[PDB]
A = this chain, B = another copy of it.
Amino acid sequence: TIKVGINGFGRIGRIVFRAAQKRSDIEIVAINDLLDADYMAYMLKYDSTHGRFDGTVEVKDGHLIVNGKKIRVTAERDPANLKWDEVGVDVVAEATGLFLTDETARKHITAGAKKVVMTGPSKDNTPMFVKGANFDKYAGQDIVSNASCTTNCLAPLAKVINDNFGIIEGLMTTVHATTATQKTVDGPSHKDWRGGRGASQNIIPSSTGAAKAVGKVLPELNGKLTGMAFRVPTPNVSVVDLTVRLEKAATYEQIKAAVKAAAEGEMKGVLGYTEDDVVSTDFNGEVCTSVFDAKAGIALNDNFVKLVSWYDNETGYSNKVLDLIAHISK
């Protein structure tokens, strides 16, 4: 098993922790955050979106005991002091949002970890990987990024469509759940003014991490795709609305068949496929990072189509963080 330390116990850190409980290949052995262990235990035990933790959580001597296993709890501000080697950590899930460059994330390796996976898009040239788009390009790097949830939805779908029909150009929108960066009522957000406005009251235009990341994980599409977001008052699950022009003419049935074939074969567990009358809550807990909604999309003609794909922006991305941890450990 791969021993993992989580740095940062926010939404991603906690859902990564829960996802790792259900996997035999990865074992969380340590968590670092500026939260007391008893408060960590509370945040783990109770979740408004995903329900009660499936297992036992004890606090003993400042550490967590989860399903009888001891999890080392620390509260280090400087990752260089984390002594990851003292708990045999192989890979660090870097989930604070604060260490998205090589120089900052490398402190985990100085502290004894072997590799680091950033749970967000890198801010320098640290390479990004998206399962179903470019895991096979990984080349042994000791620090990597799993991109972002929206990129994990867009890229697998864009790859199937491009590989089969040729994307000339495309624009996308994600209609995106409210997240922790937003405000409950109009409040200060000096670097993103719209993003300070009351989240439960508003449709809020925003920028998406996918516009900059998708051409990095699929270089053949660089400069051919961009987009934006609308944040809306739901607590989880988002949807990509991808408008593409195709080089090869394809009927909507042919598009469905290509997506379905990828979902049942090469991209199984990454790309999903449904023909049901689904809505966003039907993907709360979804592990696939891109679930194609066949009935929701619409074609104007054989070369211009709007495609719809769902993603649980918490669960899918967290599971693929673990997939990236496993992949770089092979």
Contact = CB atoms under 8 A, between A and B. Distances in A.
Contacts of A295: 205
A277 interface: yes
B282 A46 contact: yes
A171 interface: yes
Nearest to A211: B298
Nearest to A201: B48
Interface stretch (A62-70, A118-126, A185-193): A185-193
B281 A197 contact: yes
Contact of A51 (B43, B203, B284, B296): B284
A267 B117 CA distance: 49
Contact of A203 (B180, B232, B306): B232
Tallying the copies of this chain within the complex gives 4
Contacts of A182: 184
A238 B169 CA distance: 27
Given A46-B276, A171-B298, A203-B232, 18 more contacts: A10-B187, A11-B186, A35-B190, A46-B278, A49-B198, A52-B282, A169-B300, A170-B300, A173-B241, A173-B306, A175-B175, A179-B184, A182-B184, A185-B235, A198-B281, A201-B280, A202-B280, A205-B279
Contacts of A203: 175, 232, 234, 237-239, 279-280
